[PDB]
Amino acid sequence: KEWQENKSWNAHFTEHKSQGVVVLWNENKQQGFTNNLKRANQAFLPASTFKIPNSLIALDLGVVKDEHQVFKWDGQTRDIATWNRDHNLITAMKYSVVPVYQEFARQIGEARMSKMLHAFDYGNDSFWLDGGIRISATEQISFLRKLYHNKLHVSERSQRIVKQAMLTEANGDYIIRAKTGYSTRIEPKIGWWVGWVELDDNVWFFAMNMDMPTSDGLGLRQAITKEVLKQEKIIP
Amino acid sequence: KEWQENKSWNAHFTEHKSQGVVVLWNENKQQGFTNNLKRANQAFLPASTFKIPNSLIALDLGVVKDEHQVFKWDGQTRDIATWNRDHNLITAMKYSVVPVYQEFARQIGEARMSKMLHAFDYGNSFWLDGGIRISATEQISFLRKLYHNKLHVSERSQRIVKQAMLTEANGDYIIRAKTGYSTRIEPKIGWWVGWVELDDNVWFFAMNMDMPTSDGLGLRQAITKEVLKQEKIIP
Numbered sequence: 001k002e003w004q005e006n007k008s009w010n011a012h013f014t015e016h017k018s019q020g021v022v023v024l025w026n027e028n029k030q031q032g033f034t035n036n037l038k039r040a041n042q043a044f045l046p047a048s049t050f051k052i053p054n055s056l057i058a059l060d061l062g063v064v065k066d067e068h069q070v071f072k073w074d075g076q077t078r079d080i081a082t083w084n085r086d087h088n089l090i091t092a093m094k095y096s097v098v099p100v101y102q103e104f105a106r107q108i109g110e111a112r113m114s115k116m117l118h119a120f121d122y123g124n125d126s127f128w129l130d131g132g133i134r135i136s137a138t139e140q141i142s143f144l145r146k147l148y149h150n151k152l153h154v155s156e157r158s159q160r161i162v163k164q165a166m167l168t169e170a171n172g173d174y175i176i177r178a179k180t181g182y183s184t185r186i187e188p189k190i191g192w193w194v195g196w197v198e199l200d201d202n203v204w205f206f207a208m209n210m211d212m213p214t215s216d217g218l219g220l221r222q223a224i225t226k227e228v229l230k231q232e233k234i235i236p
Numbered sequence: 237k238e239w240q241e242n243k244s245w246n247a248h249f250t251e252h253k254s255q256g257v258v259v260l261w262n263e264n265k266q267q268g269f270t271n272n273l274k275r276a277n278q279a280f281l282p283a284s285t286f287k288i289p290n291s292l293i294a295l296d297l298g299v300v301k302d303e304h305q306v307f308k309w310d311g312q313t314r315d316i317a318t319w320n321r322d323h324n325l326i327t328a329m330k331y332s333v334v335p336v337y338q339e340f341a342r343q344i345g346e347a348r349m350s351k352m353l354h355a356f357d358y359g360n361s362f363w364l365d366g367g368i369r370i371s372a373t374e375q376i377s378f379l380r381k382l383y384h385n386k387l388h389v390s391e392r393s394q395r396i397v398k399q400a401m402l403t404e405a406n407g408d409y410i411i412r413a414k415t416g417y418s419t420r421i422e423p424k425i426g427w428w429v430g431w432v433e434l435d436d437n438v439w440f441f442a443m444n445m446d447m448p449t450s451d452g453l454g455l456r457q458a459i460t461k462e463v464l465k466q467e468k469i470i471p
């Protein structure tokens with residue numbers, strides 16, 4: 001619908017010698033805001049943000065029975081400690097456990113994965129890491145709004161379970177449901193944070209990506225998004 | 237002399253795809269604020285902001301008798317229309333009439349210019365392409381002496397220059413200020429320095445910003461005012 005460029009948010013990026021985009025969508029007012037309309041509409045690899053639709057499809061097809069089912073560690077030690085243990089959907093999403101999601105994708109199969117992504121109108125195996133799938137910030141928001149309103153073609157149940165699994169932060173002021181991403185297999189190397197802020201009276205959808213040349217800057221994904229949310233008085 | 241960085245003002249620069257510093261000084265609270273403590277303390281060529289001390293010295297030495305004395309156009313046409321006419325101190329300051337100020341400087345002479353700038357503790361054609369340099373915070377320090385009539389020149393000299401600095405006034409505020417554009421030496425910068433008089437307080441300000449072309453000159457005032465609006469110093 002209607003979009004507005006707010007170049008003042010660029011200050012949040014330059015303060016950290018960083019480049020990227022934040023996109024906000026005010027659900028009540030049906031209005032979007034971004035520091036960079038062009039980058040807002042540039043498609044990148046989803047990386048770990050692909051765990052949202054992967055989770056939805058796995059649940060809807062019964063590849064994942066529920067958020068309690070245990071996926072046993074395969075015993076192969078990997079360089080992220082949190083991966084080297086048993087997981088359920090909740091902890092697999094929280095710790096971005098690629099091995100668990102690769103197994104989901106194999107059991108889903110490329111034919112069913114394709115029909116589901118087409119039905120989700122999601123962007124355009126390992127394809128979400130080093131393959132052809134691409135999605136923009138504004139496309140992330142468009143997908144997330146369908147998930148929020150249970151409007152994706154999968155069961156309501158599938159959508160409620162994934163939204164539970166997206167829980168990141170909650171207090172008396174706000175709830176954040178979101179997914180982090182880090183795309184390194186193809187240039188440019190970017191960090192993602194996509195999801196939404198639930199308030200008493202409104203929802204603010206958000207999608208941000210930023211240049212991530214090294215691991216060191218990963219915290220800026222959350223820190224820069226929150227600086228924008230603070231500035232717009234969406235959270236304290 | 238306590239200073240505080242307020243990085244939120246950087247929004248006013250980035251909104252205009254621009255880089256620079258604004259420095260504010262709250263006279264009542266004796267506190268300063270800037271978006272960039274480092275750039276606040278970087279010295280640049282004063283350019284037309286040098287007309288403030290040049291005016292003060294010219295008046296104190298009797299090179300300029302008063303704000304009404306006429307400086308006759310020398311008849312040489314220059315690329316700034318407003319320069320191609322007679323001027324007094326008021327219009328020479330308003331239109332930044334370099335030829336008038338060069339004549340002041342010649343009659344002052346380098347010896348008296350030097351002793352006066354030392355007595356003013358001012359910074360470290362010389363103000364355009366020479367050795368004189370001043371920071372935003374040094375501008376504020378000089379302007380506060382002018383405001384309080386504490387520069388070593390006559391009170392009269394100081395009142396006349398403050399009159400000549402008048403830029404804008406209404407029922408909300410008075411601005412006394414001088415614009416500058418430094419182009420002879422890199423980096424090319426715009427200046428706006430002066431103060432905002434309110435009923436109960438004075439806010440000193442000094443801003444400079446990268447000015448690669450003529451196109452952005454209005455941002456000197458526009459960005460300073462966005463900061464003054466945000467801090468609720470003016471509506």
Ligand SMILES: *C(=O)[C@H]([C@@H](C)O)[C@H]1C[C@@H](SCC/N=C/N)C(C(=O)O)=N1
Binds near residue numbers: 080098
């Ligand atoms: C999601 O964005 C994941 C999270 C851990 O940052 C990344 C992990 C990579 S594969 C493993 C690379 N790092 C190993 N130490 C990934 C992907 O390539 O899509 N998602």
Ligand SMILES: *C(=O)[C@H]([C@@H](C)O)[C@H]1C[C@@H](SCC/N=C\N)C(C(=O)O)=N1
Binds near residue numbers: 283284285332363419
């Ligand atoms: C002050 O900053 C001046 C205003 C007009 O922008 C600016 C003009 C330049 S050119 C000097 C003119 N040369 C001969 N008449 C200038 C400077 O060079 O310092 N200041």
Ligand SMILES: [Br-]
Binds near residue numbers: 163164167
């Ligand atoms: Br929940």
Ligand SMILES: [Br-]
Binds near residue numbers: 048
């Ligand atoms: Br991640």
Ligand SMILES: [Br-]
Binds near residue numbers: 391392395
């Ligand atoms: Br007098």
Ligand SMILES: [Br-]
Binds near residue numbers: 398399402
């Ligand atoms: Br006056």
Ligand SMILES: [Br-]
Binds near residue numbers: 284332415417
């Ligand atoms: Br000027």
